[PDB]
Each structure stands twice: as C-alpha cells, then as structure tokens.
C-alpha cells in the first residue's frame, strides 16, 4: 500500500459512525485514513494536469541574419531606397554617412545610406494561457490488507480494483465516487479553488523546459515576438531587440545579431515554478487540494472470519518508519483462510494487555491457500514493547523499543 | 591624396629649417604636414595588428551533457559508486535519498546515491595575451603632387612609390625611414608606449567576434574554464557552473545544463573595445601613436619649372571640404611640361594680391603630354575670393565664398 514510504504522511482518524471526513491532499504527500470499524485506506494526489492550453505570444531568444545589402546616395541626390525595406521579414536602418571625392561623390558632406538584412529566428520560447476549466486531478487510493509486492510498485492493480483505484476530478465536476469491490466505496467532494489562482499566470516553454510565470513580466520582455502559431511563416515585431547596426562605410553598414539570450532568460527565471509536459498537456508539481470523503458505503470484507489458528513467520524483520510505525511482512503456512490475523503489541507477555493501536485495521489474509504473505502496520507506544502475532504456542514475538525520536 | 575626405584631419606646419616635427597618428584620423619649401604630405595610421598571440585561459559559454547514469545503495549498505566518477570529463554529485520498503530497501532511512553525466562544451571563448613584441603598426604616406584617381582608390601602385609609401613599425623597431623617390625621404621616430598600455588587457575571441578586455574582469568570469590550448581534448574545471542536479528519486537525480551564456556576456561586454581578425592575426581599431618626423631629406622636385603657359579647364567644379579647404580638378591641354602650375586666390582681379595659402605645395604637372589631370587644394580666406588658375587670357577663375560658419 502507498504512503508507508512517503515522508510527508498525515495520519487522520475519524469517529465511530463518521460517514464524512475532511482531508488535505498535496503533491509529495499522502493521507492515511483510519476509522473505527472501517478499513484503513491510503489516499494521495499524484498529478495535476492542464489540457487545451492555447498559445498567446512567442518570443525569439536566439536568431541569425542573412542577405545583407545596402544602398547609398551622394549628398543632395535624394534619399536611398532598397527593395526589401517593405519586406515584413527584413530589418533595415537608414542613416547618414560622410562622403567626399575619395568615395565617388562630387561634393563633401553627408549622404544617404540604407542597410537591410533578413531576420530569421533559430530558437523561440512559447507562452500559453491557463484557464482553470482545463484542469484535471488524479487521486489514487489503496487498501490496507494485502501482500507486499503491491506496494508503490505494481501500480497495475486498478484492473482488478478491490485494493487500488483511481479517480479523476475537474473543477466542473468535483464529485466522484470510487468502488473498491468487496470493501464498498468512497465518495470524494474536492474543492479545487484553494489551490492557486490562474488568472494572472502563463505556462512558459523553452527547449523542452517549462515554467509558470506572471503575466506582466512576460509582456515586458524585450525580444522579438509574434502572436502565433505560426501561420506558416511568422512576422516578428521588434526585430531591433536582437539586431543592431554598426560601422559607417561609404556604401554599407554592418548588421550584427546579439548572442543567444537563453542564459539570460534561464537566469532571471529560477525564482518561478516548474512543470513538465507528457504529453501535449502540462503536468504541474506545485499544487494543493482540500477534499471531503464520504465513507458510509465503505466496509470491511463482510465476514466474521474464524481466527487464523495456524502458524505465521516473519519474512522481513520489522522496520521503523520515519513516523514510528512498524511494518511487518508475514508468511502463513495454514489453509484456513480467508481468516482474521491475530496480532497485537504487549507490554507484558502474561496478560497481553493491548497497548498501542493497529494502523492496518483488522488484518485478513486474502488467500485461503498456504504460505501466503501479508503486510501489517502498527503504532507502538513509547518505551519497550513486544510485537505478538498468532495464537497459542504458534505465535511469534519480536522485541521492540520505540524511543519516540 | 588621402585625408581630404577624412573628417578627423589635423593640419600641422613646421618651422623653416625644423628638421623634426611631432605628430599624433590615430585610427580614423589623418595628419597633413605642411612646410616652407617642402612638399605637403599626408600621413595616416591604417592598421594596428597583433600576431603570435599566446592563449591564456578559455571559458565555456555553452555546453551540453550526455550519458546520464546513477548508482544507489540501501541504508547502511555502504556508499554508492559509479565507474566514471573518476573521469575528468564527467561531472558527478553524491547525495543521500529517502528509501523504504516501497523502493526495494529493507529499512527506512537515508541511502546513498551518486549521479554522473558527461560534460561537453559546445561553444567556448578564448582569452589571449598581448606582449608588445608582437605588435605591428601600418602607417601610410602620400604626397600632394598630381592625379585624382590615386585618391583612396588605386592603392595598387604604392610599391612603385614616388607618391605613395607604406611603413611598418614595431615596439622592437620604432625607427623607420620612408623613401619618396624624387621627393627625398622622411624619417619616423615613433614612441609606441604612449599609444595604449597593453599590460592589463587580454584579447578576447568569441564566435568569430573579438574584443579587448580588462584582465581582472576576465579572471572573474563564472564559467567552466581551462588554461592552455586544446591538448587534444580539454579538461574543464568548475563544470558545476553550467550544470546542476535536481530531483531526489530512489535511484537517480536529474542533470540539467544552463542556457547559453552568450547573451549575458555580450551584455556585460559592450563596455570594451572591439577588433577584427583578418587573418589568424588580430586587427585593432582602438589605437593611438605619437611620432616624430625627420624632414631634412624631404624636398620638392628640385627645379623651378617654366610655368604652364597653356590653358586649363575645370572638370569637377570646386568643392568645400569639411574643414573649409577647396579641392580643384583641372585638365591641361598643353605639352610644355613638366611645368609649374600657376594658381592662387585673389580678392581683387586688378592686383591679383595672393590671399590665402596653398595646401598643395608647389603644383607641378607630372606629365609632358596634353589633356593631363591634376588636383590642387587651397586654404581660402574668409569672405569672397576668386580661384585664379593659368596666365594671360587663357586662365580660368571661379568665384568662391568661405562663410566660415
């Protein structure tokens, strides 16, 4: 079952009837749900995805030029004109230049000079819009009471359901009920608005790297840009951002592009969010969610099982998690299942006074055959204790010490 | 002759004997040297070239990675080890990561994880040293004497000399004398140290674009770097400048490179000088020089030629230069050369009182045939004047007005 590895794990217990329980789901964190007379289940938000993201504007962060040309006119011989100063893809600059007898002109003074080149964008970054309608949340559920291989590994258990289940949530459909076969079902009313406002944020992509940025900063960027995308060939406005004109030759200037601004953008960006895009749909990691579970239709596997009377053995020795709980995997050699597993923690082996609670509510061996494996989770009390599993002489006990640190 | 087009033109007159006169030669500027009974000559520093420049240090301003790999060890199961964490070309990071039953490990806690990738530099900039031994200055000289096509055009016959001559100067050989055939010779004692101190400057090259930068700024660049030249494949120090490590998976991190820092450098670079490189040798434009001319062996073509008695005509109408001097092109149809050209400026046509000086020392028609071409330069006095050329009735006069505003 999920969560037992998770570090940001929240323990929550309901009441006796309960029916409803409030939870807080969050990326990188899980919620373990315990309840009196109800099976303990683990819930976790796995992904927060955006779809149908429409582009808005694209900026060019690396470009190059080609086909340089210039046209010059002597003093008092009218303005110069080059063919391509009306071409939307060419960038040009008009200027005056010193002319004399040396460079052909009959007089000395200022003459006209126009210089054009062809702008072409090698690498551009793209900004896209985020309307909260196109939001999808994936919430995964798993059930305490089955095996070990089905941990966070073997995430292929939805096809048999029972233990593991998925639910998908939308801001326009926050309700969702999830069936768990012989365990009943669970309803989920999840209020998403508490997450984060998307009315002033853009999804930025650049060289298969993604961010979330504020609108005003995006609009002010000093680079060539187009709306998009790209209607075959784009028309870049403000080509002078990356291009400039040097020199003052008799018959030409020199056009020159600025270096790739990829590093400059990367720099003034780390103070923002990150995202992925698998696939053609953005996947956020910076999320948040407040949900409400409806547990009336949740239930144990409805049999008063005859207790497991045969012998258990520890396959893996118990291990302390980061929260103090004890995990225990057991192999059972009996054939009297599906039986109720007798397991507790004793501070005294004579009276077997039940100290501490169980996290896996009512352990039951799913199979009826022998040599089956099952994992249980316990919440030990501070100090010394003994982990007792079984009945009679065929019970195994492991000494435990919970420092509580 | 040069300079007449040049805007940053300095007129300098010596004494009567003089022998030596100090001048300041500078890129984009000329010096006109006039003297009594000496031919007027134009001097200009055209290029300042550096050769044999030894590399010092190269910085990598755009890079990429490849062959990512990771190795992990369970809690208390020793440190992790990857093959290539000893390879000088790979960049690696060791770290601890959360491990539990979910991700294979028998216990919960920190486990070891090392992640390596192969650093490869796509684009690097190179800084080179400048020792004054490897310095070359090209100084061009021309003589006011005849022609017009030999302006800034037809720099082809300069090795046939007479009028045009080149000299090359080195800090290890600052003395240089230049012969001008029938005009004599000119000595040049040029002190280069006053030009520009090159003891705190590096020649920076980056993507076929070049600069001169201050040493301390070059040493401070925060990029991967290596000292020297190639050694086949380089060993980059401080690869972590462009590389960083994200994620904290059970079995790996993620390596990521920063964008090309070319734009950031371009930005924090414009506040320095610029240069070109034609070819495999640096060519500077930001220069300066103080020279001392030795004119004892300079002289007119030593004959008092019988004056040109035939008629001249103006091909080009006279033109005002940027400094107020007058250029005049004349065609001569007589065959009594090489003759002395009679030309002056008169404020009164009765007395022909010679007002204003001539810039072209002793105009002489070089050729003996007819229909020869010659250019003269005059320094007119303020107000009205008349440009008189010729003798008798077959002389042509052009009205001129130098407002001086």
């Amino acid at each position: 079952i999920r969560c037992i590895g998770v570090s940001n794990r929240d323990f929550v217990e309901g009441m006796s009837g309960g029916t409803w329980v409030d939870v807080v789901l969050e990326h990188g964190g899980c919620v373990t749900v315990m309840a009196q007379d109800k099976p303990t289940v683990d819930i976790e938000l796995v992904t927060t995805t955006v779809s149908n993201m429409a582009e808005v504007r694209s900026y060019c962060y690396e470009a190059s030029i080609s086909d340089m040309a210039s046209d010059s006119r002597c003093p008092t011989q009218g303005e110069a004109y080059l063919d391509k100063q009306s071409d939307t893809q060419y960038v040009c600059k008009r200027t005056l230049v010193d002319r004399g007898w040396g460079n052909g002109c009959g007089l000395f003074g200022k003459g006209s000079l126009v210089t054009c080149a062809k702008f072409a964008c090698s690498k551009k970054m793209t900004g896209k819009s985020i309307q909260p309608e196109n939001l999808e949340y994936r919430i995964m559920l798993s059930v305490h009471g089955s095996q070990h291989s089905g941990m966070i590994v073997n995430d292929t258990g939805h096809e048999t359901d029972e233990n593991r289940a998925k639910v998908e949530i939308t801001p326009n459909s926050p309700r969702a009920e999830a069936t768990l076969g012989g365990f009943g079902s669970l309803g989920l009313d999840c209020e998403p608005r508490t997450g984060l406002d998307f009315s002033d944020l853009y999804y930025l992509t650049m060289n298969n790297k993604h961010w979330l940025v504020h609108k005003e900063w995006f609009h002010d960027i000093p680079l060539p840009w187009h709306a998009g995308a790209d209607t075959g060939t784009p028309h870049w406005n403000n080509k002078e951002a990356l291009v400039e004109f040097k020199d003052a030759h008799a018959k030409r200037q020199t056009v020159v592009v600025l270096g790739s601004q990829e590093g400059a953008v990367h720099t003034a960006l780390a103070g923002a969010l990150e995202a992925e895009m698998d696939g053609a749909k953005g996947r956020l990691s910076s999320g948040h969610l407040k949900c409400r579970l409806k547990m009336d239709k949740l239930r144990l596997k409805g049999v008063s099982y005859s207790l497991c009377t045969a012998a258990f053995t520890f396959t893996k020795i118990p291990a302390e998690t980061l929260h103090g709980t004890v995990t225990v995997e057991v192999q059972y050699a009996g054939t009297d299942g599906p039986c109720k597993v007798p397991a507790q923690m004793a501070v005294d082996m004579q009276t077997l006074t039940p100290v501490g609670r169980l996290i896996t509510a009512n352990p039951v061996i799913t199979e009826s055959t022998e040599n089956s494996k099952m994992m249980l989770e316990l919440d030990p009390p501070f100090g010394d204790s003994y982990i007792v599993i079984g009945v009679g002489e065929k019970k195994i006990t492991h000494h435990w010490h919970r420092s509580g640190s | 002759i040069r300079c007449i087009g040049v805007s940053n033109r300095d007129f300098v007159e010596g004494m009567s004997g003089g022998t030596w006169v100090d001048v300041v030669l500078e890129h984009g500027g000329c010096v006109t040297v006039m003297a009594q009974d000496k031919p007027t000559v134009d001097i200009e520093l055209v290029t300042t070239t550096v050769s044999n420049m030894a590399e010092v240090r190269s910085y990598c301003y755009e890079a990429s990675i490849s062959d990512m790999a990771s190795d992990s060890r369970c809690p208390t199961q020793g440190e992790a080890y990857l093959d290539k964490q000893s390879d000088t070309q790979y960049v690696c990071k060791r770290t601890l990561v959360d491990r539990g039953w979910g991700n294979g490990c028998g216990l919960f806690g920190k486990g070891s994880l090392v992640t390596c990738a192969k650093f490869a530099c796509s684009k690097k900039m190179t800084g080179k040293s400048i020792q004054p031994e490897n310095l070359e200055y090209r100084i061009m000289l021309s003589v006011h004497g005849s022609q017009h096509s030999g302006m800034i055009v037809n720099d082809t016959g300069h090795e046939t000399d007479e009028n045009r001559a080149k000299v090359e100067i080195t800090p290890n050989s600052p003395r240089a004398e230049a012969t001008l055939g029938g005009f004599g010779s000119l000595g040049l004692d040029c002190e280069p140290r006053t030009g520009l101190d090159f003891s705190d400057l590096y020649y920076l090259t980056m993507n076929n674009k070049h600069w001169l930068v201050h040493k301390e700024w070059f040493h401070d660049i925060p990029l991967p770097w290596h000292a020297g030249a190639d050694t086949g494949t380089p060993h980059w120090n401080n690869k972590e400048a462009l590389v960083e490590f994200k994620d904290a998976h059970a079995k790996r991190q993620t390596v990521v490179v920063l964008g090309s820092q070319e734009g950031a450098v371009h930005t924090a670079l414009a506040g320095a000088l610029e240069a070109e490189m034609d070819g495999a040798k640096g060519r500077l434009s930001s220069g300066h020089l103080k020279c001392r001319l030795k004119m004892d062996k300079l002289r007119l073509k030593g004959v008092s030629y019988s004056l040109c008695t035939a008629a001249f005509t103006f091909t080009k109408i006279p033109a005002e230069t940027l400094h107020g001097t007058v250029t005049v092109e004349v065609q001569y149809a007589g065959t009594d050369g090489p003759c002395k050209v009679p030309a002056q400026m008169a404020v009164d046509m009765q007395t022909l009182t010679p007002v204003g000086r001539l810039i072209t020392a002793n105009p002489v028609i070089t050729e003996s045939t007819e229909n020869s071409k010659m250019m003269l330069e005059l320094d007119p006095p303020f107000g009205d004047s008349y440009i008189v050329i010729g003798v008798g009735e077959k002389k042509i006069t052009h009205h001129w007005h130098r407002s001086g505003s």
Partner: antibody
Amino acid sequence: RVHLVESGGGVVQPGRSLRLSCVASGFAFSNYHMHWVRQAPGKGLEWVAIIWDDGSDQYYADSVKGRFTISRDNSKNTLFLQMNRLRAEDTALYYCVGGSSAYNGDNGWREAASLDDWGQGTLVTVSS
Amino acid sequence: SALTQPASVSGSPGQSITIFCSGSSNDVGGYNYVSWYQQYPGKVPKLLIYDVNSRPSGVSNRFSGSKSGNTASLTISGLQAEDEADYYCSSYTSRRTWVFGGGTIVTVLG
C-alpha cells in the same frame, strides 16, 4: 579583360598543409567577393568558401570548417586559401572565382554577389 | 548540404527540356539567388543564369530560369548539339553560404 591565375597546386602528404594562391588582374579587386570552389575529377562542383571584398567576414562550408582558412591582400590583388590537416577527400581541382559586389550600379552593395568570373584553377593531389 | 539535381536529361533536337534543382526553405525557397552554370567536359564552368531568371550579357536566350516553391528549374528550349554538357545549379543559403547541386548531364538524342 578579367584574368585570374591560380598557383600552389601539387602533391601533399595526407594530414599536412598547403597554401593556395590566386592573383587577379584587369579589374577592381577591392569590389569583388572571392570564392574558392573545388571539383573532384569526374565529380560535381563543391563550394568551399567566401571572403568579402574588404575581408570583414568569411564563410566556409561544413566540410572544411576548422580546417581551411581563407584570406586576401587587396594591396596585392591576391587571394590565399590555407588548407591544414589535409585528407585524400580534398584531392580536387580548386577554382578561384570572383563575383562583383556592385548591385544598383555604384550605389548598392550586395552579399549574394553570385559567381561571375571563374579562373582556370589549380589541382591539389593528396597522395603519399 | 546538397541540392538534388537529376542525373541525366535527354531530348531530341528542337525540343524543350527541363532540369530540377530542389532544396529547402532555407536556400531555394528562402531567396531568389539561385544560379545555373554550364560546364563543357574539361573546361571552366560558365555562368548561364543568375538570380533565378536573369542571364548575363553574351548568353543565348535559349536558357530560361524558373522557380516555384522550394524547387528551381532550368529550361533549355531549342535543343542543339552545342548544349551537350554538364549543368549545375547553385544557391545562397540561410547560413550565409553557397551550395551547388549534384549536376545533370544533358545529352542530345538523334
């Protein structure tokens, strides 16, 4: 009226160096972009490199990037192609050619000067 | 890197023949700077067409240059024995470079 004469061709050891020269005569060298274009015996033409009239910029084909270097002296009307780290692949006839950069007619200046005048070319054999 | 020109083109005398010169949006489709050169075997190449459709002084008007999209075409109208030769196309590039085609050999039938 327009003459271009190549020189320098011959045999060269593999992995060595050779300097090819091109002298011009009969036209204003300072206004022509100059190209090196090579052709293997019985093969198609292959553009090698360009240098502009003033030497401001030079541009090379991908096959010779970082191996060849083009340059020129306008005060001599001469064009040089320095070939380093040679290979048998580079055994070919090298034509020195020149396109005029005047477009509008003493008014315009043009980068894509086309390939007007072709020289005879000199043969470079890369054999041991 | 390469311009795709046909290998051979065959026509009877009098006929008009057409020669490929296919490239990309960054050479033929990006500019109007494609030229055509005629090379006789063992002779220096000769410029026939420049700037797509213009011909230099002293070239027969039998050679015409078209271009459409990313493909330029050379048309030889009125085929003669004199036209038996190699024909190359060249083009300026978005990389500030020039590039030639494989070349087409024109042989006159009959």
